[PDB]
C-alpha cells in the first residue's frame, strides 16, 4: 500500500540518514513531492516482508550484499539508467550491483573495514594480529584495553576469518558453487580460533557490540577497534586523535574484508518508480548529494568517479579500500543473505564459548546447505501445487527425492484432510497479502506446543500448498512468493537444530 506522490526511503541507522533527509528536503523543494527517510531496526530484514505485501518504502538503501535476493524474489524493480549514467559510476561497482546481467540497484559507495587505533595510547599499531595480546597486556597495566570492536555482527569479525583462508562461495568456470562453502576450511578455523583465544585471554569481551565499542573508543578507553567509514564521524566529535590503517596481517597473510557497495534499489510494488529514479540519479548520486551524506556520516569510497578526487585528500579512504584491495567484493547471490545469518550464529556461538570453534563453523556451513535446500524444495512445489503444472527447471539428487516424496505425502494428507484445511483457511480470512504475511504467527504457533515430528512439518507444507492453491483462486498469486520464504525462515530460525540432527532433507525423505 505505498502511497502515490510521496517518496519513502529506508536507510540503516548507522548511516548518514540526516544527509539523506537533507537531500530529500532539496528534492521536495525542487520537484514538490514530500520525501521521508526512515531507519527501521534491521531494515535489511524489514524491507522484503513489507514489500512482499505491496507496502514499504519507495527506495531501499543497503549494501549490494543482499539486493540480489531482493531482485530474484521480485521485490526490486529493474532500473534503466542510460549509457551516459552507466558511465558515471565505477565499472566494478556496476558489476557488483548487477544481477543476472541486469542492473537491480544504483551503487552509492564502496566501503570496507579498517583498523582504527588511538595514536595517543598506541604510537604504532601492531602490524599483525599476533601482537594484540602483548599490547593488550601492556595496556592492561595502565588500565586500558588494546582492541575492542563489534563481535555481534559477522561482518566485523569476518576479515580475520578470511585472512588465512576461508571463502563464502567457491567460484568455478564463471559461476558459484552454492554447494561449496569456505566457512569450514582451515583458514576460517584458524582465524576464528585466534579470535576466541583473544576473547578467553580477557583481551576482549563477547558481549561487546557496535555501540559499546564505539563509545569506549570515543571516550579513549580502548586503543584500537575495527570499523568502517560510517563510524569516523563519531570518532571525530569525541576529540580523540585517531589513525586508521590496514587490518593487521594474520599468520603472515593479510586480512581480507568483504568489500561492500552501499546501493539504492527501487521497490517493485512502488507505483512511484520514476520518482525514485529521479531522486537517485538526478538528486542523490551527484557531487553535492553524496557530499552532504558523507559530511553527515562518511559513507566511504564513493562510487562516483568525479567526487573521487575529493575522496583522495583523506587518507582514511585510502586505508579503507587498501583493506578492500586485500579483500573481495561481496557476491550478490541470494544465498548470501542466509550465509550471513549462518556466520552470525557461529561468530556468537564460539565467542560466548557455547560451541567449540570447529563446531560453530560446521554449523554455519550446514546452514548454507540447509537454508537454500529447503527454500528450493518449497519452491517448485508450492508454485506447482498452485498452478498445477510442474516446473521443468533443474533442481540435486536429494532435491529431486525430496520433491517427489513431498509431492506424494503432501497430496495424500491434503486428500485425507480436505475439510479441516478448508475450514481453517476460512477461519484465517486470508484475502490480501498482509494475511499471508501474518501467517508467520500460525507458523510459530504450529511448533510452539513443545514437541517436534516430521508429520507436523509435512502437514504444514501441505497446508501451505493448499493456501497457495486458494491464493491462485483468489488471484493473489504473488502471495505464493513470500509464504514459501516465510516457512524457510522459521525452519532455519527455530528448527535448524532438528534439521541438522536429522541429516537435513535426507532424513526427511528417509522418514517418508
Amino acid at each position, epitope marked *: 500500500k505505498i502511497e502515490e506522490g510521496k517518496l519513502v526511503i529506508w536507510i540503516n541507522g548507522d548511516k548518514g540518514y540526516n544527509g539523506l533527509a537533507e537531500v530529500g528536503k532539496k528534492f521536495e523543494k525542487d520537484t514538490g513531492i514530500k520525501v521521508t527517510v526512515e531507519h527501521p531496526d534491521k531494515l535489511e530484514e524489514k524491507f522484503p516482508q513489507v514489500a512482499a505485501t505491496g507496502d514499504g518504502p519507495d527506495i531501499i538503501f543497503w549494501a549490494h550484499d543482499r539486493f540480489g535476493g531482493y531482485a530474484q524474489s521480485g521485490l526490486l524493480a529493474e532500473i534503466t539508467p542510460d549509457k551516459a549514467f552507466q558511465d558515471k559510476l*565505477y*565499472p*566494478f561497482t556496476w*558489476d*557488483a550491483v*548487477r544481477y543476472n*546481467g541486469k542492473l537491480i540497484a544504483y551503487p552509492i559507495a*564502496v566501503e570496507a573495514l579498517s583498523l582504527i587505533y588511538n595514536k595517543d595510547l598506541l604510537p604504532n599499531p601492531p602490524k599483525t594480529w599476533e601482537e594484540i595480546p602483548a599490547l593488550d597486556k601492556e595496556l592492561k597495566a595502565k588500565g586500558k584495553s588494546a582492541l575492542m570492536f563489534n563481535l555481534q555482527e559477522p561482518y566485523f569479525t569476518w576479515p580475520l576469518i578470511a585472512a588465512d583462508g576461508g*571463502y563464502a*562461495f567457491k*567460484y568455478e*568456470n*564463471g559461476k*558459484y558453487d552454492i554447494k561449496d562453502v569456505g566457512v569450514d576450511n582451515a583458514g576460517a578455523k584458524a582465524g576464528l580460533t585466534f579470535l576466541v583465544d583473544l576473547i578467553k585471554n580477557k583481551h576482549m569481551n563477547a558481549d561487546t557490540d557496535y555501540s559499546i565499542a564505539e563509545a569506549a573508543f570515543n571516550k579513549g578507553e580502548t586503543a584500537m577497534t575495527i570499523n568502517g567509514p560510517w563510524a569516523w564521524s563519531n570518532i571525530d566529535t569525541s576529540k580523540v586523535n585517531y589513525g586508521v590503517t590496514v587490518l593487521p596481517t594474520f599468520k603472515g597473510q*593479510p586480512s*581480507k574484508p568483504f*568489500v561492500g557497495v552501499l546501493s539504492a534499489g527501487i521497490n517493485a510494488a512502488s507505483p512511484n518508480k520514476e520518482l525514485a529514479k529521479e531522486f537517485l540519479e538526478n538528486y542523490l548520486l551527484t557531487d553535492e548529494g553524496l557530499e552532504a551524506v558523507n559530511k553527515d556520516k562518511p559513507l566511504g*569510497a564513493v562510487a562516483l*568517479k568525479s567526487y*573521487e*578526487e575529493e*575522496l*583522495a585528500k583523506d*587518507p582514511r*579512504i*585510502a586505508a579503507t*579500500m*587498501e583493506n*578492500a*584491495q*586485500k*579483500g*573481495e*567484493i561481496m*557476491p*550478490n547471490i541470494p544465498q548470501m543473505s542466509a550465509f550471513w545469518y549462518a556466520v552470525r550464529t557461529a561468530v556468537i556461538n564460539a565467542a560466548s564459548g557455547r560451541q567449540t570453534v570447529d563446531e560453530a563453523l560446521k554449523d554455519a556451513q550446514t546452514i548454507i546447505e540447509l537454508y537454500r535446500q529447503s527454500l528450493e524444495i518449497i519452491s517448485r512445489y508450492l508454485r506447482e501445487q498452485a498452478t498445477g503444472a510442474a516446473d521443468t527447471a533443474p533442481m540435486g539428487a536429494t532435491s529431486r527425492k525430496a520433491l517427489e516424496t513431498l509431492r506424494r505425502v503432501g497430496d495424500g494428507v491434503q486428500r485425507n484432510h480436505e475439510t479441516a484445511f478448508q475450514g481453517m483457511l476460512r477461519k484465517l480470512d486470508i484475502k490480501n497479502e498482509d494475511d499471508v504475511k501474518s501467517l508467520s504467527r500460525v507458523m510459530i504457533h504450529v511448533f510452539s506446543d513443545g514437541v517436534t515430528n516430521w508429520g507436523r512439518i509435512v502437514t504444514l507444507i501441505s497446508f501451505g500448498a493448499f493456501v497457495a492453491k486458494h491464493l491462485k483462486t483468489i488471484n493473489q498469486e504473488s502471495a505464493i512468493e513470500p509464504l514459501a520464504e516465510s516457512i524457510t525462515d522459521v525452519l532455519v530460525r527455530t528448527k535448524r537444530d532438528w534439521l541438522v540432527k536429522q541429516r537435513g532433507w535426507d532424513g526427511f525423505v528417509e522418514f517418508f
Partner: antibody
Amino acid sequence: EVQLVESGGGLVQPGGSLRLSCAASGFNLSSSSIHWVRQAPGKGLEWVASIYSYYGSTSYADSVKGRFTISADTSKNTAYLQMNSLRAEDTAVYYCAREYHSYWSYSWWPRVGLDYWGQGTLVTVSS
Amino acid sequence: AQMTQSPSSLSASVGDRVTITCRASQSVSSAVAWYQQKPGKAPKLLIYSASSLYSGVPSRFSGSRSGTDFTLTISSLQPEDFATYYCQQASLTALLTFGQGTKVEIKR
C-alpha cells in the same frame, strides 16, 4: 603450464590496418582478464587495451581509444587486437598478458598484476 | 592516473637496499604491482597488491607501502636482480598505468 603466444605482427603502412592474434594454452581465455601492452624499442611498458569485466567490458588508453578494438573468441581461445589508422609511433613489441585471481566472482576485483606474458610480436609501421 | 617512478636509474653492488619509490597522483587505488624486465625478455611479475609478492619470487623483494607511495625494496641485491623494474597501477576504474621504469646496474 600457461603459455600464450601472439602472432600477426608484421609490416604495415602509416594509417594502415592490422590485427594481432594472441592464442593461449593452459587456461581458458574467457575466464580471465586480458590486457594488450606494448613496449616501444628502448622504452618502458605501455598498456594498450583491456578486457576486464566478466561481461566483456573493454577499456583502452587514450592514444588507442576507439582506434584499437580488443575482442575475444571463446571458441578458438584467441584474443584479438584489431587496429585501424595505425600510425608510425604505434610500432612496438606487443605483449598479450593475462591477469587472473582465484578469488574472482562475477565482478573481477581486486585487480592483480599481469601474471603471464607472451613472447612479444614486434610490429613495424613505416613506409 | 599518473604514476611517477624514482630514481631514474640507481647504481648498486651485490647486497644493498637501493629502494625504488612510486608516487600515485590524484589516484587512491592501492592495486599496484612491480614487474622485472631483463633485456629482451617478457617482464616478470615481482609483487602485486602493493604489498604481496608473486609466488615463485625470492623473498629479497618487498612491496612496502607509505600511504600515497609504494616502494619496492631488495634486502640484499644479487647479480640476477640487475634489470629494469616497472611499477604499474590498476585503478579501481577500468585502466592500467605503467611507471617510467628504473634501471639497476653494477657498482664497480
